[PDB]
Amino acid sequence: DIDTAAKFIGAGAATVGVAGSGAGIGTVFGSLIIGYARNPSLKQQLFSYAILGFALSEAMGLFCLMVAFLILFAM
Amino acid sequence: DIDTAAKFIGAGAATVGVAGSGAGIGTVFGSLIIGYARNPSLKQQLFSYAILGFALSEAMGLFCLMVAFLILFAM
Amino acid sequence: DIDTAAKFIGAGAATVGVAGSGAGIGTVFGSLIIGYARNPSLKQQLFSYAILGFALSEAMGLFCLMVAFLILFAM
Amino acid sequence: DIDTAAKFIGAGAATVGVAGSGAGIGTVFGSLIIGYARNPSLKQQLFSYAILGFALSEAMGLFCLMVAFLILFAM
Amino acid sequence: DIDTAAKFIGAGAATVGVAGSGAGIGTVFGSLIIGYARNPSLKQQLFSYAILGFALSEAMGLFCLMVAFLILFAM
Amino acid sequence: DIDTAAKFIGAGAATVGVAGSGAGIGTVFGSLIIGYARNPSLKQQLFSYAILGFALSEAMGLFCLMVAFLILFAM
Amino acid sequence: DIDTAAKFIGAGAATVGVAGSGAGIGTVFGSLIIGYARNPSLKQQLFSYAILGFALSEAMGLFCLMVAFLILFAM
Amino acid sequence: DIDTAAKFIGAGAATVGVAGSGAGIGTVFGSLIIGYARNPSLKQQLFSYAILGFALSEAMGLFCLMVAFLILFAM
Amino acid sequence: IPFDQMTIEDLNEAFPETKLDKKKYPYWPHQPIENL
Amino acid sequence: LATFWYYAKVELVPPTPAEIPRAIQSLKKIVNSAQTGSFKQLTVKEAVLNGLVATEVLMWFYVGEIIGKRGIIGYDV
Amino acid sequence: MPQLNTTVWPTMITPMLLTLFLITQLKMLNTNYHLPPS
Amino acid sequence: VPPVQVSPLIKLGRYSALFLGVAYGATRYNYLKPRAEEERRIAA
Amino acid sequence: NLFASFIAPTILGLPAAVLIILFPPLLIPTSKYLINNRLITTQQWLIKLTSKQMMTMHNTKGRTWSLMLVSLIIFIATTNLLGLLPHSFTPTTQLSMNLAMAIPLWAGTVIMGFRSKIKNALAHFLPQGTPTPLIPMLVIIETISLLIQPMALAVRLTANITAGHLLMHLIGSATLAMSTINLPSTLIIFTILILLTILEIAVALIQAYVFTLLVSLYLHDNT
Amino acid sequence: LQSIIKNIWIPMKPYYTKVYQEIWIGMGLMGFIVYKIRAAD
Amino acid sequence: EVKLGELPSWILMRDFSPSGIFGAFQRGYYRYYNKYINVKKGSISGITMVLACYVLFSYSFSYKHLKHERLRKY
Amino acid sequence: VAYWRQAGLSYIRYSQICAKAVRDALKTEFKANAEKTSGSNVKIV
Amino acid sequence: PPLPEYGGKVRYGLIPEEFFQFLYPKTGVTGPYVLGTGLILYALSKEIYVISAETFTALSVLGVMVYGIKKYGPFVADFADKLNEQKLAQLEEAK
Amino acid sequence: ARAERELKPARIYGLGSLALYEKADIKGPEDKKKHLLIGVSSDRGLCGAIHSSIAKQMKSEVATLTAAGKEVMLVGIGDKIRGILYRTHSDQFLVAFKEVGRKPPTFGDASVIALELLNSGYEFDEGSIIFNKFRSVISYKTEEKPIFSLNTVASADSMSIYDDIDADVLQNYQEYNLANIIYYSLKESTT
Amino acid sequence: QMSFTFASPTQVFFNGANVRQVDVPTLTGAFGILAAHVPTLQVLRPGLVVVHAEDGTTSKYFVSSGSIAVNADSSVQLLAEEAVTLDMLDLGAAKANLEKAQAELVGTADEATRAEIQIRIEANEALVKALE
């Protein structure tokens, strides 16, 4: 019953890695705010770039989350 | 005996990941301050983006909490 | 026993998650400094945003502490 | 049996390290938004640099993931 | 004993929450440098803000520290 | 026999927290570079602030290191 | 038994350290985007500075794989 | 033998703390890029500051490595 | 004597303006650093 | 490139059967100074020169040893 | 860590004090920059 | 620069030492291989 | 085994570390000539540039240390540069020598700040415009910062040089171990080793400069 | 006692007697620290 | 000087005093310095040779550690 | 500091080369009147 | 006393011409070279030179040194010579 | 007639160029030494008291400045003002300009005058421009406009509210404003 | 609230007009100015100035160089040396002059002459990108 314990602790460790995606999404949307305040006539393209950056950062975060779930359930 | 102990340790390690949403919210609202100090006529839309950014960054943090509450109680 | 040990360890781990609150508070108030240096006429409103930003980022850290005091004293 | 247990724990610890790539991709695309808002005529070359950034930062994260898997399955 | 051992480990873990205060102090003072380079006639007001920001960020950090001590000495 | 082991683990965990001071010093001196490039007439005062910021940011890191030693050598 | 287990855990923990290299590469290339949008005539000097910063971030990353290998092999 | 095991674990934990220097060096050299794009006639002095920043931020990370070796070899 | 056979003491003798003010500046480099 | 062989074809070549007498000449000469003890009239200049030549032929012996073991760094077994 | 062995510490302290505080400074004192001629 | 013909004694010494070294190397190789393999096997 | 390059060297039983520490000044020849050889010319140009870099920010009392601080940066740099040569023992990898360099100089600055300057010395622990309810904490912080400054100096120099040398030795071990395996990977590892050698040269110079600059700032805050 | 005090101590006298006094106090403190370190070893 | 002398009484006639050996080392340093460094249009070789000798010295006291990493046995 | 200022130019020269370039790209229906309205005639003595 | 205009004619930066000229009469031109190669082979053949990580760190630092010398030697030499010529010109202007 | 038709957009332009210094309230340095005095006239005579007004104002302010210790350098746009002021004020003279009046002034003329006032090596601390402000077909009055330096607009405390400003943008702005004030003076003096 | 004065040395486009947003190509980047925008002063580079009226309509011009001043009372002053409505420019001439400037750049070897050639190159590049 040590594999179960290790799966719990390793899944917690694995899901630690979502902090990076959180901070990266914060950075992407803060820079969206700044770049829209400077050039409010590029709103659509700036939002497109923000969507792309958020998608990639959350992709890394979800990679961490799915490694966690793989350890926790799929071994 | 050891699986509940590791559940505690994994719940702690999982809720570590809220630091990312904390830093991301800090960045979002600092950029709101800056972009509003530049061009305050956009105060609505800027703030709108902030909320969106907030709701996304915090979202990542919630995932961590969720897996914490998944390790601690649901298992 | 092993459970009280893991309660200590998990409380410490959960407390780790206040680093994001610290970093976000730093970002919020640094951006308040910069935005006040740039447009000192908006100071009051800027400070308003800062408060909001602060009150939000710290909140995330608080959740971490809560989980800590949930593991170490509650459950 | 402790070996497989520590393999789980070490894979989780290793995949913690994707947070850096998440934050770096966030930074790269936020700076792309900002620099495009300032000089929207370089939209092409700027994006190229962003791609390069997203190619390098994420690479580091991927490294961690492989290391994680190298601990979980191979050796 | 095993409770004192995990008290050591939990204090060491809770001590990591000072990285946030370190990075936040770095951000607050870098932004003080930038805001003073922009508007050197507000050197007083800005600096006030700076200390305030510092006084808050370090605050969170010290919370973690006392938590660590309260794991190590109090309970 | 096990308390010394936990002392090693707790000292490593406690010294993790120097990453925040590393990042904060990076931010302080990068902002010194930027603010001096913007207004090279304040080179002295700007630099002074940098030192102050550094001397404070690094301080937090040393805190962690002290705690590390207080776990490794004192107890 | 337990020594190889701890070697796996320590290898994972040590490879956590290149998250900072990933984040620093993100910062370097985002600032390259920004600086090129500012002064698109110094493209060569800006790219040289970016390559230097990337090399130094990855050297700080190598300093963590040094310990990741002094644990897994040459205990 | 639990002492050598915890020595490996604590060495990995201590090595975690070099992410801060990686990220801070990224910040320093990205800010070098920016400040040089904004005032390329100060290329010397700016670079000097960059060097200083590097040498300080990196320093913090090495402190972590120091503890790592103190845990791994000098107990 | 040509300046490639010359000593700093020979220069302080030939051009007394070049002698360092060891009384106004008693410590190395015996002159203002900007003068250097 | 090719200058090395241009120099080797004069002194880095095996002794022809015609000068093996001349060789032993000098050899006896040397032991003749070892017969009487007159080698002390050799100033340390040519003494050092002869020592260098002897070290060189010893290095020849050792290169022969490494070609006689089919391995440069020590004995492979 | 051989840097922790305090037995060879004086062997590392004593020459440095002679090298940093006496010899390097006696060589810098003989490095003089005269004033420019008219 | 014109070459210099080496004295025949030095040349004969060079080549005699080279050949004696070839013989010595082969001899000591064949001498050491059995004992070497012997304690290699005896160690396991 | 791995730290064999940081053990006090001995030749035939004698402390060769004494010779290694006394050697660096031998490389700086001096002359009374007005116009002299290329080595002394380049070295005097370097010493003048270094003096102008380190000493211009100081007042008349701090500039009295021009002989000291320069002698510091000339002594460390060469000692670090001579440490990159093969098989060399680098005394700046020793916490002993670095502590003996850091504690005397920092202590001298703080003591000359507490002998005179004492009003302003005690005022320095508090920033000028510090708000009132925070005055206590900023005195607990600055005090231990000042008390750790010398250990920070010594440990920065020691750890940086030792870690650079360890990383170079480990990459050399990797090259040697993988020489009998893939040659392309061996040459890319050797290219990493070359980049690391150039980085280590730069780091030798930078660490000398930063040690001296921190000592210079401690002196500036006390004159 | 000649050349040594002529070529070693006369040049370094202005620094050893007036400039490095606090450095001499600091070297005393450093020697004390080193003695107490070697004592606990 | 030697390279011409051919007597063992020379070995004992020299000045094996502290000041004598000091003067011997100083004369050697000045011979090297005058031959290789103290010239106009000087060469970097006058330095590298020294460095070479240094490395040789550095290999001498490192041999005790290195001989434990030989790759053969004899 | 732009590339032309590092080269020693001024903003009065930047505008002249930028206004002249904008005039050169005018369709010839406006080009004559434009270059006659904005042309310089003062001589330096 | 003025200075000589050249040094001692070192080969490869390690061995002076004096050695080659002193070994030339007895063993010709390739005498010293084969002596050096034989010494190297005897050293790395009887484990007088142990091959380790320090071999490759030495190769790296030696390659970097030789490259730096070949690339910045003319520049450093001309820099020192122009410093001395500027000083000489200023002095003869003041004369 | 044509000059008065062209004076309306030229007046809007030249008065919008000066709105910054009127809203930021730049006050000029009463302490600095070097001064640059520009006088706008034409190359043609028979104009009445145009050139005489410019010359009287120029020499009056030259006296008033040199009595305060300032070293004044003169610029004369138009041959008439240089001719009138050359004999008694030549020691204080930097450059003059010809071919003013035959063809109506353009912005290229102001740009050329601004270049040869910038490519002069005369780093002035403050300047004035003396022109004939047009009031009606019957009346005109001789007016003065101040010309600030980079250090005057950078050291002003009222300029701390202008964001995204460094010395380079202020240099470019002051150069363009020199050209603008010269153009406005030329368009006011031709009418 | 924003009073916008856009003028050329010979033509007035707006005089105290009440617009809601103006996009300008400053030498330190492009930006859009609305009411209460932070006070700033900049010099322009060749590019499009898009004035947004309260009617939702936009007027596009192509300024060559000049100055922009946003003041604390929301008054904006845009002064262009050569401001031209887009219907007065053609693409072919811009492209031909860009080619000529690139050729004389790859020919010229002096520093300031090459600076002037680069200024002409970037002006014609902005012209081409603005037309299309």
Structural summary, described in words:
Chain M: This is ATP synthase F(0) complex subunit a. Chain M: Belongs to the ATPase A chain family. Chain M: InterPro entries: ATP_synth_F0_asu, ATP_synth_F0_asu_AS, ATP_synth_F0_asu_bact/mt, F0_ATP_A_sf. Chain M: It is found in: Mitochondrion inner membrane. Chain M: It comes from Homo sapiens (Human). Chain S: Belongs to the ATPase epsilon chain family. The structure holds 19 protein chains of 12 kinds. Chain A is mainly α. Chain A has 3 helices and no strands. Chain L has one helix at 8-43. Chain L is built from 1 helix and no strands. Chain L has 44 residues and is mainly α. In chain L, 82% of the residues lie in helices and 0% in strands. Chain N is mainly α and 41 residues long. Chain N has one domain (4-39). In chain N, α1 (4-19) packs across α2. The longest helix of chain N is centred in the C-terminal third of the chain and has 19 residues, at 21-39. Chain R has one domain. At the G-H interface, α1, α2 and α3 of G face α1, α2 and α3 of H.
Q: Using DSSP, what is the number of strands of chain N?
A: 0
The separation of the N and C termini of chain N measures 39 Å
**What structural class results from the helix and strand content of chain M?**
mainly alpha
Task: Quote the beta fraction of chain M.
Answer: under 5%
Strand content of chain N: under 5%
By DSSP, the count of extended strands of chain M is 2
Radius of gyration of chain N: 15 Å
Most extensive interface between two protein chains, with residue counts: A-B, 43 and 52 residues
GO molecular function, one term (chain P): hydrolase activity
Family (chain P): Belongs to the eukaryotic ATPase epsilon family.
InterPro entries (chain P): ATP_synth_F1_esu_mt, ATP_synth_F1_esu_sf_mt
Protein name (chain P): ATP synthase F(1) complex subunit epsilon, mitochondrial
